[PDB]
């Protein structure tokens with residue numbers, strides 16, 4: 001019942017010795033294989049310090065901004081998130097399947113909110129690349145698409161490895 005013998009993962013990671021300190025920071029979830037997760041728009045995960053997680057998302061009109069907080073535990077590529085009672089539908093085991101640390105990562109996991117399985121693509125969110133161009137209604141959405149496009153070859157190559165294509169994912173940030 002630990003991460004060591006978690007059975008819901010379907011794929012072998014390309015990053016079994018994931019460097020958690022390098023993985024840490026803010027990530028925006030661009031797309032994934034779960035229809036249910038399309039209801040949580042422009043989700044940003046913020047992994048910080050030893051084991052902290054702050055997750056923030058909206059509905060599809062950008063209304064009802066929601067924040068859930070939790071604790072993580074990493075063993076190589078595997079990680080659990082235990083959310084505060086609030087986001088318990090998202091508490092699950094997860095696995096980083098691929099990342100270049102600096103730009104993108106592809107993650108699998110088994111939350112109830114995803115009908116027990118999802119693979120998703122996330123791009124790094126940093127003020128070094130994100131200049132809220134004051135006047136933009138679609139701040140997040142434009143950032144995400146540009147970051148996707150900029151890293152598209154690498155993302156597509158890794159997805160191919162897990163028998164997926166970007167175009168087959170549901171977009172989860174416009």
Ligand SMILES: NCCc1ccc(O)cc1
Pocket residue numbers: 029032037038040043045055081090118120172
């Ligand atoms: N810690 C992220 C949990 C999650 C994964 C994928 C997604 O589209 C929304 C939430």
